[PDB]
Design a binder for this molecule. Structure first.
Ligand code: CL
Ligand code: CL
Length: 162
């Protein structure tokens, strides 16, 4: 199991513009297109991201290309962030995937905001960090997915995904 297969399970694959949990226009593997309510603003962004006139439909390869970009952008955002970098460096390889996961879903600004949990992660206080992360809008809105991520963090194993 690795970050890519982990995120593909959490996000799924959709080749046609869809709306995410929050209602935003998305496509492929959790690739957010726009927060705007306009389906046209969405097609527009989609064509911009792909480099062709898509009419809201992409191929698997296109979806996988956006996905590779986004995981890389996720890792780089963590290593560039003064709040995140230190937690990340401190963690084992499994735990690292889990923070990448959070960052992919919520953006670096958002995860950087979980101040207390990051501090408990850095101190390797696994159970307490788990209890604290669950006290969030995140957990309340996408509980099955949060649970899995949280579990990866608490245990350092891929159990939740197997
Ligand atoms: Cl893009
Ligand atoms: Cl969920």
């Amino acid at each position: 199991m690795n970050i890519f297969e982990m995120l593909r399970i959490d996000e799924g694959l959709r080749l046609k513009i869809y709306k995410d949990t929050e209602g935003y226009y998305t496509i492929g593997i959790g690739h957010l297109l726009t927060k705007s309510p306009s389906l046209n603003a969405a097609k527009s962004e989609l064509d911009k991201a792909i480099g062709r006139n898509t009419n809201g439909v992409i191929t698997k390869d296109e979806a996988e290309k956006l996905f590779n970009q986004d995981v890389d952008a996720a890792v780089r955002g963590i290593l560039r962030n003064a709040k995140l970098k230190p937690v990340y460096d401190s963690l084992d390889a499994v735990r690292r995937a889990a923070l990448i996961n959070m960052v992919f879903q919520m953006g670096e600004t958002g995860v950087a905001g979980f101040t207390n949990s990051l501090r408990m992660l850095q101190q390797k206080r696994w159970d307490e960090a788990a209890v604290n992360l669950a006290k969030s809008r995140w957990y309340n809105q996408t509980p099955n997915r949060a649970k899995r991520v949280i579990t990866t963090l608490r245990t350092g194993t891929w159990d939740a995904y197997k």
